[PDB]
Design a protein around this ligand. Sequence first.
Ligand SMILES: Cn1cc(-c2ccc3nnn(Cc4ccc5nc(NC(=O)C6CC6)cn5n4)c3c2)cn1
Ligand SMILES: [Cl-]
Length: 291
Amino acid sequence: TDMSPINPELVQAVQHVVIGPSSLIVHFNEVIGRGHFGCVYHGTLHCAVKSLNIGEVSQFLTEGIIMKDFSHPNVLSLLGICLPLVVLPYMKHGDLRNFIRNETHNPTVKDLIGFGLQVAKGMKYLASKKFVHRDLAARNCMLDEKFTVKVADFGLARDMYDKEYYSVHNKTGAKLPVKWMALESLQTQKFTTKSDVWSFGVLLWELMTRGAPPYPDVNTFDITVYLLQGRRLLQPEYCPDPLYEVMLKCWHPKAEMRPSFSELVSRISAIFSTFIGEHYVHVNATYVNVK
Ligand SMILES: Cn1cc(-c2ccc3nnn(Cc4ccc5nc(NC(=O)C6CC6)cn5n4)c3c2)cn1
Ligand SMILES: [Cl-]
C-alpha cells in the first residue's frame, strides 16, 4: 500500500443466551430507529429489540454466544436473542453524535474528552478479545441514563444506521465508512485494531467539533488521494493541543506506529484530569447544517 504522500453442541452452548418467547414483549408501534439489516423497536423484557430477516441460523446462534461473552461498562452488552430478534439494553440518550450535536446540550471540554476516554476503554477491552470493530464512529457509540458511553454497532447489532456516511466501492460493491478508514484499509479493504485506532482518532475529532462531518465534500474513495497529498483533519477550535497530538498519532501513516488502545486510555486520562469543567464547547458556524 501507498503510505508516503505523493447441531446439539451449539444448542446447549447457546442456552445461556436465549430468551423465552413468553418472557419478552416487543412494541412494534414505536420505531426507535431503522437500519439496512433490521428495524429497531421498543421492548419489555425495558430494552431495544432489533428484528433481522437454515445455514444462516447457525451463524445467528454462534454470533450470540460470542457477543454474550463481552461484558464491559463501555461496551453495549447483549441481553439475549429470540426466534430473529436481538435484545439490547435501551440507551436513553441515543447515539453519541446526535447527543453532542444537540444544541440544547451544553458539553464542556472535560465532558467531551471524558466521552472519548470512555470509548477508548471500550476499545481497549474489545481489542484485548482480538475483536476488530471495522466501523468505529460517534454514530455507532451510545449513551445511557448516567452518560456512560457504550461502544455499539457490532455482532448481531451490526448495521448502517446513517446511510449518508457509507460509500460504495465500485468493484466489490461494499458500502464502507470511508471518512473513518485508515489509509491502508482504503486501499486493501482489510481492517485491524490499528485501523480501529485511526477511526478512533476521527471519533475524537467528531467529539471536539460536536459532531461535524469529517472532510466536507470529500465523500468517495478519492479521500485516499486527498490524504496522500499530505493532509489530516484540522485541529478543532476547542481541542487542546495535547489531544490533537494524540489524534495525529492515531493517523500515523505506518499502522504499527499508532498507539494501542491501552496507551490511548493512559494518555487521554492524563489530559482529561487537567480540565475542571469551565470550558464550554460551542458549535462552529461553518459546520452547522453540513452533511
Ligand atoms: C443514528 N443511529 C445510530 C444508531 C445505533 C448505533 C449503534 C447501535 N448498536 N445497537 N443499536 C441498536 C440500538 C441499541 C440500543 C438502543 N437504544 C436506543 N435508544 C434511543 O434511540 C433513544 C434516543 C431515544 C436505540 N438503540 N438502538 C444501535 C443503533 C441508531 N441510529
Ligand atoms: Cl472544561
